[PDB]
């Protein structure tokens, strides 16, 4: 086979996983949407791309969402010009999907399990109360002047009212443009300004891993510098005297108090903006409505195969494209309960993702690789005595899941009877692109699997910018045709829209993700196409690098990077990150990296041995908790964790 899988201390032969008897419609479980097989998920899969594919789009977009005009055309448009649309005559209220309609129905059932940063703190949400507080944000912002298309900032902690204030916002057609409470005020001027916003959302603090959020005080700072901001408005999270601007500063509870605690619903229509979302030039990555809505919806339903009495506990943040998707708009259009978890995983101690799945019961947890690895650095006894059968399904996003982490995972969050399903996506396709699905797809470990409903991708030999045919073939991820989700610009710079995803490979979308497809079909997400490393025409995948030392005994996280080289083209370079409690004075430093090279060796082969190897605390890595690679790049090639790197290369 020309195509491996990542490294694993398993055999290939015995590392194929059927979908465990929780996802069988065993043990009074839910019978899944889609099963039992491979078969089952191809017969449905191929109903939504091609020429014949309208047909069911059509009915999803009609059964899956209230409209309040039908829409008559499905799909028109395309990349080369990024005028892509979906039910372009159909008019919709995002706010009225996941709350109102739900609301009319049973008012009292739970729609957000608000878990606190202190676990006393927290509580159940109904449907009528998340809605009730919606209506007023939005009567708040209506009386300010806002009107529909006017953009709103959002600098919001993970606090259940950060959901209000994403539906406020839809609810009355206002664009919301959140930043993660925790940038810098630089990093939020910058956003701000950007995206013109003349009304911002915020609290006095947060609170996160018992720490404070100077979330008021960065507000005040950035917004020295952002000359349109004129109203304020302060959610008082923790109370704690923070600075107010007399006439552009007022309080959350005081406004909403003067208002009804009902609002009508903006008709928008399918294509009207719902946000954008700055990824860190920051691009400004918008959305439109009814095709994003749907995409959440039913990626929701069908990659973790929720059903109606279903908790749903997401554990990222709202700032996140994750957050987004998954923890307001897809759980709350489908009517379920879903979780904001306002803390840390080791807050206060790492049996906290175990302590709240069994405290509120949840019945799927979907968190990034960086949080698995992280919690595995921990030890099994803040997971070993704990139930945990509540869970039928495990998610990963962020990054690749290294079968090491992927089995930790599946042993200890799962017992051995959950799905693991690996969804790879970007901000940018709005919702998940590639992952199994859980009552049908046997999961290979570290393997996004198959792409999801309306999703056709191939793979790139971008040496010859030429389409590979087949299977065990590998290059860079491509998409042949929209799908309803997709990103529709960067906000006031389209032309950066175009010639970042439509542009290097002209007819498809390029995800910039270097990707494998195998013997059996399945697709692999390797790492970006950026991080790629060529050793004497050997283009090495950094999950590939990364997932061989990582079995390596002690080893808790590694990151490899490229760097010039006048014999190989380029060299590999590894900074490792042990377990805490590994013994560095009794392993000789120079004995672990040869071991550490020996290993790569064997796996991956003899030119992927890295030229260097740094140990290191920590990895530079973004509050989402991807690994800054690029700069692991730099410092090799000339917050607090990247001047112990510069230091450790000297
Ligand atoms: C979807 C939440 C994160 O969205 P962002 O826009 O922040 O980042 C998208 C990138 O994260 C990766 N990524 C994400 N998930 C996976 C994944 N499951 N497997 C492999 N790579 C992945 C891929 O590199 C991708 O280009």
Same mark, same amino acid.
């Given at each position: ?163 209000? *204030?994403?539906? /406020? ?6 664009? =919301? #443009?959140?930043?993660?409470? %925790?940038?810098? +005020? ?126 749903? *506990?997401?554990? /990222? ?6 957050? =987004? #998707?998954?923890?307001?708009? %897809?759980?709350? +259009? ?317």
């Amino acid at each position: 086979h020309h195509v491996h899988p990542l490294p694993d201390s398993v055999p290939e032969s015995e590392d194929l996983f059927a979908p465990p008897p929780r996802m069988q419609g065993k043990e009074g479980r839910p019978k899944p949407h889609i099963g039992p097989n491979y078969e089952s998920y191809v017969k449905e899969w191929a109903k939504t791309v091609g020429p014949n594919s309208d047909e069911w789009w059509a009915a999803k977009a009609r059964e899956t969402l209230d409209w309040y005009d039908d829409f008559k055309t499905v799909r028109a448009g395309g990349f080369e010009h990024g005028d892509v649309q979906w039910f372009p005559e159909g008019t919709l209220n995002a706010a009225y999907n996941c709350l109102d309609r739900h609301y009319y129905k049973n008012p009292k059932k739970t729609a957000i399990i608000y878990e606190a940063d202190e676990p006393s703190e927290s509580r159940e949400v109904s449907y009528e109360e998340l809605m009730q507080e919606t209506c007023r944000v939005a009567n708040v912002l209506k009386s300010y002047g806002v009107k529909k298309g006017d953009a709103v900032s959002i600098y919001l902690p993970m606090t259940w009212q950060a959901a209000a *204030a994403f539906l /406020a916002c839809a609810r009355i057609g206002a664009i =919301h #443009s959140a930043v993660f409470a %925790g940038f810098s +005020a630089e990093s939020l001027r910058d956003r701000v300004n950007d995206c013109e916003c003349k009304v911002l959302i915020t609290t006095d603090e947060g609170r996160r891993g018992g720490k404070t959020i100077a979330t008021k005080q960065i507000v005040d700072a950035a917004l020295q510098q952002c000359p349109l901001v004129e109203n304020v408005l302060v959610l008082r999270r923790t109370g704690n005297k923070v600075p107010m601007t007399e006439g552009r500063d007022k309080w959350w509870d005081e406004e909403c108090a003067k208002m009804p605690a009902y609002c009508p619903c903006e008709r928008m229509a399918s294509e009207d903006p719902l946000f954008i979302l700055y990824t860190s030039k920051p691009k400004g990555v918008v959305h439109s409505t009814a095709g994003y809505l749907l995409g959440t919806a039913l990626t929701l339903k069908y990659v973790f195969d929720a059903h109606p009495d279903d908790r749903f *506990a997401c554990m /990222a943040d709202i700032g996140w494209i994750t957050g =987004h #998707s998954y923890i307001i708009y %897809g759980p709350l +259009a489908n009517g379920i309960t879903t979780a904001v978890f306002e803390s840390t995983p080791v807050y206060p101690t790492p049996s906290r993702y175990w302590d709240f799945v069994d405290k509120w019961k949840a019945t799927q947890l979907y968190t990034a690789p960086t949080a698995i690895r992280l919690l595995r650095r921990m030890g099994e006894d803040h997971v070993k005595n704990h139930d945990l059968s509540s869970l039928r399904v495990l998610g990963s996003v962020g990054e690749p899941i290294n079968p090491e982490a992927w089995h930790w995972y599946n042993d200890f969050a799962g017992k051995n009877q959950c799905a693991i399903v690996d969804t790879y996506w970007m901000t940018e396709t709005g919702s998940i692109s590639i992952a199994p699905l859980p009552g049908a797809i046997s999961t290979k470990p570290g393997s996004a699997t198959f792409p999801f409903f309306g999703m056709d991708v191939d793979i790139i030999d971008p040496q010859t910018g030429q389409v590979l045919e087949g299977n065990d073939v590998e290059g860079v991820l491509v998409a042949r045709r929209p799908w309803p989700s997709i990103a529709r610009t960067v906000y006031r710079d389209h032309k950066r829209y175009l010639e970042t995803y439509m542009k290097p490979y002209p007819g498809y979308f390029f995800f910039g993700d270097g990707a494998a497809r195998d013997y059996d079909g399945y697709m692999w997400i390797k790492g970006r196409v950026d991080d790629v490393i060529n050793v004497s025409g050997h283009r090495l995948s950094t999950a590939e690098v990364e997932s061989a030392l990582i079995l390596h005994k002690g080893v808790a996280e590694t990151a490899v990077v490229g760097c010039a080289d006048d014999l190989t083209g380029q060299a590999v370079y590894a900074f490792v990150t042990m377990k805490p409690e590994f013994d560095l004075k009794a392993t000789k430093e120079a004995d672990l990296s040869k071991e550490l090279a020996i290993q790569v060796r064997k796996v991956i082969g003899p030119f992927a041995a890295p030229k260097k190897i740094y140990l290191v605390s920590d990895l530079p890595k973004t509050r989402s908790g991807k690994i800054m690679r690029r700069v692991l790049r730099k410092i090799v090639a000339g917050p607090q964790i990247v001047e112990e790197v510069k230091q450790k290369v000297t």
